[PDB]
Design a protein around this nucleic acid. Structure first.
Ligand SMILES: [Mg+2]
Length: 64
RNA sequence: UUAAGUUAUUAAGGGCGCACGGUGGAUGCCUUGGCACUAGAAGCCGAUGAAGGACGUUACUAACGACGAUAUGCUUUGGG
């Protein structure tokens, strides 16, 4: 996903970070009520956040 | 039949021998871990916050290992 993330702009990555965190939080609430049934989405969204934070961190270090 | 003698039988339990079981973990075989060394490298890190820890991180989860709110992991370069 990193190659696709690198095509996004800086404002887009922040928006992706916010939206991914909302999705993960929604998954956690569904899991706590026994409604999820798709538990592999949790790990997938968590790693997407990790990739998104990595690309943002690289750009700031690179520019600085 | 009497009289006078003699000597068995019984095993409540026990003894010796044998047979078959149990308990127990010796012995044999085995090695996951140790012990003594050889050769080469290296030895000591820390306010750019150490050594050592606490608490957390997996869909479910107690403990250990790995990891640190990017958490049972992220990127990249090579290997496969
Ligand atoms: Mg008897």
């Amino acid at each position: 996903k990193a190659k696709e993330i690198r095509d996004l702009t800086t404002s887009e990555i922040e928006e992706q970070i916010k939206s991914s965190k909302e999705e993960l939080f929604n998954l956690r609430f569904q899991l706590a009520t026994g409604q999820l049934e798709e538990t592999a989405r949790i790990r997938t969204v968590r790693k997407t956040i990790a990739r998104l934070k990595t690309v943002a961190r690289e750009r700031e270090i690179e520019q600085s």
